[PDB]
């Protein structure tokens with residue numbers, strides 16, 4: 109239910125019924141032999157798990173400090189970690205007898221992942237997406253439609269991710285008998301922060317096994333970008349009880365923390381109740397975020413991160429648009445890996461942190477997705493660079 | 500060198516030395532423990548091998564015939580099988596002491612794969628690409644630039660893949676002491692058809708282990724699309740000596756085999772010589788190499804590898820064609836039914852597998868090589884199919 113003070117289930121009575129049935133089913137099926145037979149089968153044969161853990165040898169040597177490893181969620185089917193949660197919850201929906209999936213999306217990656225998982229399991233898919241996001245993500249919207257999903261543009265409110273979540277919750281209240289609302293991050297009312305984190309925890313379990321195989325020891329630091337916080341919780345959670353392992357979440361610093369154009373909810377947000385949970389939200393109404401990374405757009409953050417921040421188990425930092433863009437280019441040129449702009453925030457901070465650390469020490473960076481989806485954004489900025497040759 | 504009467508080394512004397520040195524180096528490193536340790540390390544940790552073998556259960560049940568399995572080369576780093584060969588040859592080049600990679604590309608996929616492998620290994624990369632292809636593939640050209648590679652637009656001739664290969668060979672003759680020419684398909688003079696097939700054979704070795712693990716038996720048919728022929732050779736080669744396993748290569752039927760707008764070199768072409776090999780080519784009465792057409796950008800090489808010409812000759816493999824229309828329907832079908840957006844090249848294989856499955860029995864098994872993912876093709880499909 110709660111993570112310290114944070115999280116909870118602060119919703120109207122119309123949502124209590126749907127959420128209670130979801131909790132019961134989840135407790136029912138999470139450790140069921142037949143459910144896990146199918147989930148592991150799809151994660152293996154369809155999604156391509158396990159993803160590798162890659163030693164960024166050239167990057168490590170260039171910086172001249174700590175060893176930089178990359179957990180390669182960019183290689184998951186769909187090109188992002190979102191698929192892990194999409195498969196888990198969609199299979200849960202199938203086991204519950206649901207025939208329809210709905211989901212919110214901002215960047216379009218979770219919408220694509222949900223569309224993919226729904227197509228896989230023969231379920232109807234409607235994706236709620238803010239009209240301003242629909243406009244910025246033409247090709248992800250087209251991907252969703254190719255996969256058999258319908259994209260419902262949300263014209264209410266600010267026409268962004270927060271509004272898409274609002275419309276999806278309204279839909280689910282009416283249609284929960286046959287519809288499962290597939291939330292895409294560790295956010296919303298209980299049991300969603302737990303369910304999404306549980307379905308992303310495979311990342312950390314693989315990473316722990318892989319780093320023990322590669323280095324004979326646990327990492328000194330784990331760095332992941334934090335939007336809502338699902339990829340970060342996925343890689344963090346299996347290391348939480350290893351006190352050796354430092355955990356660093358990287359939020360979108362945008363145009364600077366002083367500018368008020370960022371998505372650093374943990375850093376500069378206010379504690380409040382929204383979307384059925386107590387957590388940090390940026391504001392005194394909740395406002396749309398800003399980041400070069402379309403995926404770091406949720407105005408709040410998961411309550412388990414708010415908890416880990418308060419008990420000082422994880423540190424949370426910010427990286428600017430400029431810094432993330434530099435890391436996008438650096439990783440591409442140095443390791444031949446084009447990262448998602450979300451993931452590039454984590455790469456950017458890991459590079460700064462590696463410089464200050466010892467050559468015997470180990471950083472794992474969660475590479476939450478690949479950057480094919482971001483090429484239009486990077487082309488637009490790269491085309492506008494003045495004297496690109498000598499700079 | 501020869502696959503029956505096909506293959507050879509039809510190059511000027513200036514390239515015999517470089518090809519001899521490559522052949523010597525390859526024979527040495529192919530079975531070297533350290534070379535193979537490093538290659539397998541990069542294929543595992545960087546490229547993400549093994550790729551899974553996926554049972555397309557919904558597609559199988561919709562068609563109501565044979566079991567359709569998909570070898571998921573769409574999940575290799577870069578999104579296509581081209582990476583397997585790019586790493587192999589780039590590592591070979593590094594072991595030979597070379598500092599520079601050059602490569603041809605038409606669709607841009609091999610160009611990207613070469614740029615990725617060169618970036619990984621700290622080598623300079625120049626990609627030769629026909630100006631007509633540069634214009635069609637601006638995002639792949641941009642990918643190559645992001646990876647640190649220099650794309651050289653080829654303005655001579657027809658300004659397509661055949662002209663890029665000619666310029667690449669021109670470069671290599673002058674720069675071979677420090678440059679490796681990283682050919683992207685099972686084409687060119689010996690030893691390239693052999694080397695590329697060997698570096699793609701991992702696909703078939705995995706697929707064989709995976710199908711035995713899944714079903715306890717070898718497949719009845721293997722279906723792969725055939726451009727130059729590398730993804731097909733990769734999945735075919737380990738099953739060649741298994742007599743019961745049928746091999747089906749799928750060429751681009753384009754607007755139709757009678758339309759004169761296709762890339763079916765085995766089905767409709769003539770025996771000829773180009774790019775250092777004796778093989779099947781689409782060539783006119785003047786002996787000149789015709790333009791290829793296909794909705795799939797990657798099925799644009801106007802010939803085919805000599806090992807496929809051989810397998811056709813001895814009737815070990817069958818070669819068929821699938822039209823633009825059929826490939827496009829399969830692109831949509833797979834996306835909707837299995838949640839996998841395939842490359843348009845791979846969709847040719849999917850299209851034929853769907854036709855072939857319907858005729859066959861429910862107990863029988865088909866493996867389709869899904870050579871790449873379709874993210875690169877979304878603009879093409881948006882234009883041709885339209886928005887929804």
Ligand SMILES: Cc1ncc(COP(=O)(O)O)c(CN[C@@H](CO)C(=O)O)c1O
Pocket residue numbers: 187188189190212213214215216217218219269292293294333334335336337338339340402403404405406448450451476477478
């Ligand atoms: C590749 C990638 N990496 C990271 C994130 C951040 O989300 P997380 O903090 O839940 O991992 C996103 C979010 N993307 C969400 C929100 O916009 C979506 O609807 O697609 C992403 O697409």
Ligand SMILES: Cc1ncc(COP(=O)(O)O)c(CN[C@@H](CO)C(=O)O)c1O
Pocket residue numbers: 579580581603604605606607608609610660683684685724725726727728729730731796797798799800842844845870871872
């Ligand atoms: C995804 C995919 N699948 C299949 C093929 C066909 O080539 P093959 O027959 O060598 O596998 C290609 C070729 N693509 C080549 C030739 O245009 C390139 O330079 O990129 C491809 O990109």
Ligand code: NA
Pocket residue numbers: 334335336371372373397404405406407408409
């Ligand atoms: Na946020």
Ligand code: NA
Pocket residue numbers: 725726727762763764798799800801802803
């Ligand atoms: Na051809």
